Design an enzyme around this catalytic site. Structure first.
Site: not given
Ligand code: ERV
Length: 352
Positions: A203-205, A212, A219, A245, A248, A329
């Site tokens: 999970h990337g952000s 958070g 969330r 990921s 993102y 996904e």
């Molecule tokens: C719509 C959406 C949002 N986030 C992700 C990630 C992630 N955050 O790793 C991978 N696919 N994806 C798809």
């Protein structure tokens, strides 16, 4: 004024997460006017109202209402969130793509406000290192994984193998590997511990969003968010390709350091889809949605770590002909189905 005794990689991670300037840059990257709406003026109920306008656009487009209404709501959005495009025309929220883009923007705005509220709250004591104060604000145990352990060996092989050829703009170098333990998350994940089909996924952000993410977990978009603003509805999205990921993380050539999550996800019965399906509830008996991508990491090279499958195989053809997804996904619609294990610090070396 007691200097922090935390490990240096952890102290660097705390500084990088709680940086107010990185929050301001992220809002500037979205072309938000920081003069008419500075960072301290961001509101949770204001972002929720922006979510509602995005939902009002979604229902109007469906019900064949006036496209003039869709123009008023677009101008309403830009009055609610003051932007600054200089001399250009603001993008018009009149179709599904525009809704998805602004939906993703409000997800990062909601996390930025969370990080800033976490920073400017609680209690304060000038006898403690600000690094020490911010670390306990996360309510998370953070330990550095040894570079020569088998955990780091598998995690490095995970990053090494699942870098897609389509994502050729960069390659990844693993700087740090953190073993995280969110307060109370293990008790929340307990009902899903012996659910079948558990995998460790990425999970990337954005980096500013991790204040958070560590404080409140991953969330689901709030009820005001439009369900059509996300491909598979309002859930938590994961992937098995590390490059999918890492995209993102929204990493730029100016800030080439990224944070990615490795989480144990109780998938259970996978509702396997190939195209968009904007849903908030799964059909009875299902526990997750798997978007079938054309390329899937080889299932023959699957190994286990703490009883959790790790799909670190090389990308091969999946055997699915008609799909709108290049890569897999994984989506869950209950926050208790996620158990965050590791947090990685990646260097993005952009190429060509
Ligand atoms: C719509 C959406 C949002 N986030 C992700 C990630 C992630 N955050 O790793 C991978 N696919 N994806 C798809």
């Amino acid at each position: 004024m007691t200097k922090s005794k935390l490990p240096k990689p952890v102290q660097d991670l705390i500084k990088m997460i709680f940086d107010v300037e990185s929050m301001k840059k992220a809002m500037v990257e979205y072309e938000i006017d920081l003069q008419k709406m500075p960072l301290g003026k961001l509101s949770k109920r204001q972002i929720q109202a922006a979510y509602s306008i995005l939902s009002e656009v979604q229902q109007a487009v469906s019900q064949g209402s006036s496209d003039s209404q869709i123009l008023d709501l677009s101008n309403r959005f830009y009055t609610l969130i003051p932007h600054d495009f200089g001399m250009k025309k603001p993008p018009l929220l009149n179709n599904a793509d525009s809704v998805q883009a602004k939906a993703e923007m409000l997800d990062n705005l909601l996390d930025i406000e969370v990080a800033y509220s976490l920073l400017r709250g609680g209690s304060d004591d000038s006898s403690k290192d600000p690094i020490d104060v911010n670390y306990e604000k996360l309510k998370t145990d953070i330990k550095v994984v040894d570079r020569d352990s088998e955990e780091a060996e598998i995690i490095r092989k995970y990053v090494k193998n699942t870098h897609a050829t389509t994502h050729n703009a960069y390659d990844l170098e693993v700087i740090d590997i953190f073993k995280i333990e969110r307060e109370g998350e293990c008790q929340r994940y307990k009902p899903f511990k012996q659910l079948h089909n558990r995998r460790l996924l990425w999970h990337g952000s954005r980096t500013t969003n991790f204040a958070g993410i560590l404080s409140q977990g991953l969330r689901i978009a709030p009820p005001e968010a439009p369900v059509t603003g996300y491909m598979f509805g309002k859930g938590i999205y994961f992937a098995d390709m590390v490059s999918k990921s890492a995209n993102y993380c929204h990493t730029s050539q100016g800030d080439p350091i990224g944070l990615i999550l490795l989480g144990e996800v109780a998938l259970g019965n996978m509702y396997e889809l190939k195209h968009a399906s904007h849903i908030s509830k799964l059909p009875k008996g299902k526990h997750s949605v798997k978007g079938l991508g054309k390329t899937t990491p080889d299932p023959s090279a699957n190994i286990s770590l703490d009883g959790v499958d790790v799909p670190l195989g090389t990308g091969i053809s999946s055997g699915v002909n008609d799909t709108s997804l290049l890569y897999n996904e994984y989506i869950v619609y209950d926050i208790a189905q996620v158990n965050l294990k590791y947090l990685l610090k990646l260097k993005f070396n952009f190429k060509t």
